[PDB]
């Protein structure tokens, strides 16, 4: 199967080794995240003729450790979260793409509501938006949209590896983090192409190293842009209805993205490669 993939930069461990402070349960947690993601077929699920094994690199922090993990995946140390948090805030509160980002959030949040018939009032819409802003101000876990905003802060696409559901013996709850986050409100010419790649499991974010890095230096690795069933990964908040679009289904049909359009967005913001692979 010819499937779309993309190269990404592995964490520079040389910086990591210098400043590691006790997180004794690191190996135990990392191992459980690896097994969970591999068994569910979300990580290292493919095989190709031309081999790598990605391993979750856990980190300490508050909540799901999104910013600590992002900092780890970007620079090899996690204490850059503070600068990320303020930048994430300023982009939402005073950013020039604020209105457009808000439209993207409300539109997707509206669609997810339609599946459960929970229609929110206008006052409730404005309340939920300020709760999003408050979560980024400077404890409580960041949400899906904050990952989308983080991509804009970095001006770099973000790929999150995760299961789709929380399961008991049999899904009972959804996991919204898995997929592709593109910096769509930043012109592609002003963005980096190589994605920040993170994993999510047991309510925690983590960076991703490769097994080969334990043996010697390895810079690049491969991450798939489809799931293990060869379906393109979800593009988070990829739909922006116009400023003239009124919230009050021919109209709804026009804004929804086709597979061709999704591929075009990926080509615009990522260096997509195609290799023959198959699932395990």
From Swiss-Prot:
Changing residue 30 to K: Reduces deubiquitinating activity with 'Lys-11'-linked ubiquitin chains; no effect on cleavage of 'Lys-48'-linked and 'Lys-63'-linked ubiquitin chains. Induction: By TNF-alpha. Residues 40-279 are annotated as: Catalytic. Widely expressed. Abundant in kidney, heart and fetal liver. Expressed differentially among B-cells at distinct developmental stages. Higher expression seen in primary immature B-cells as compared to the mature cells. Disulfide bonds: none annotated. The keyword Nucleus applies. One of its GO terms (biological process) is adaptive immune response. The keyword Cytoplasm applies. It is found in: Cytoplasm; Nucleus. The active site is at 62, 65 (nucleophile), 204 (proton acceptor). Residues 58-64 are annotated as: Regulatory loop. Phosphorylated by EGFR. Residues 25-247 are annotated as: TRAF-binding. Belongs to the peptidase C64 family. The protein undergoes a significant conformation change upon binding to ubiquitinated substrates. The loop that precedes the active site is in an autoinhibitory conformation in the apoprotein. Ubiquitin binding leads to a conformation change; the loop is stabilized in a catalytically competent conformation with the result that the active site Cys can form the reaction state intermediate. This is OTU domain-containing protein 7B. The lineage of its organism: Eukaryota, Metazoa, Chordata, Craniata, Vertebrata. The gene is OTUD7B. The chain holds residues 128 to 438 of 843 of the full protein.
């Amino acid at each position: 199967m010819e499937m779309p993939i993309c190269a990404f930069q592995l964490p520079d461990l040389t910086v990591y080794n210098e400043d590691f402070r006790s997180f004794i349960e690191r190996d135990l947690i990392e191992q459980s995240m690896l097994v969970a993601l591999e068994q569910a077929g979300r990580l290292n699920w493919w095989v190709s003729v031309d081999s790598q094994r990605l391993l979750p690199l856990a980190t300490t922090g508050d909540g799901n450790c999104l910013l600590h993990a992002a900092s780890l995946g970007m620079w090899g140390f996690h204490d850059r979260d503070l600068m990320l948090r303020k930048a994430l805030y300023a982009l939402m509160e005073k950013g020039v793409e604020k209105e457009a980002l808000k439209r993207r959030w409300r539109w997707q949040q509206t669609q997810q509501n339609k599946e459960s018939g929970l229609v929110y009032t206008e006052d409730e819409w404005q309340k939920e938006w300020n709760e999003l802003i408050k979560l980024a101000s400077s404890y409580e876990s960041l949400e899906e949209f904050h990952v989308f905003v983080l991509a804009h802060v970095l001006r770099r696409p973000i790929v999150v590896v995760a299961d789709t559901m929380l399961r008991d013996s049999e899904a009972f709850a959804p996991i919204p983090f898995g997929g592709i986050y593109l910096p769509l409100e930043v012109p592609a010419s002003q963005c980096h192409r190589s994605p920040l790649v993170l994993a999510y499991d047991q309510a925690h974010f983590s960076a991703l190293v490769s097994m080969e890095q334990k043996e010697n230096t390895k810079e690049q690795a491969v991450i798939p842009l489809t799931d293990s069933e060869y379906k393109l990964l979800p593009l988070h908040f990829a739909v922006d209805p116009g400023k003239g679009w009124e919230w009050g289904n021919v109209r709804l049909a026009s804004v929804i993205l086709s597979l061709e359009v999704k591929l075009h967005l990926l080509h615009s913001y990522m260096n997509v490669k195609w290799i023959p692979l198959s699932s395990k």
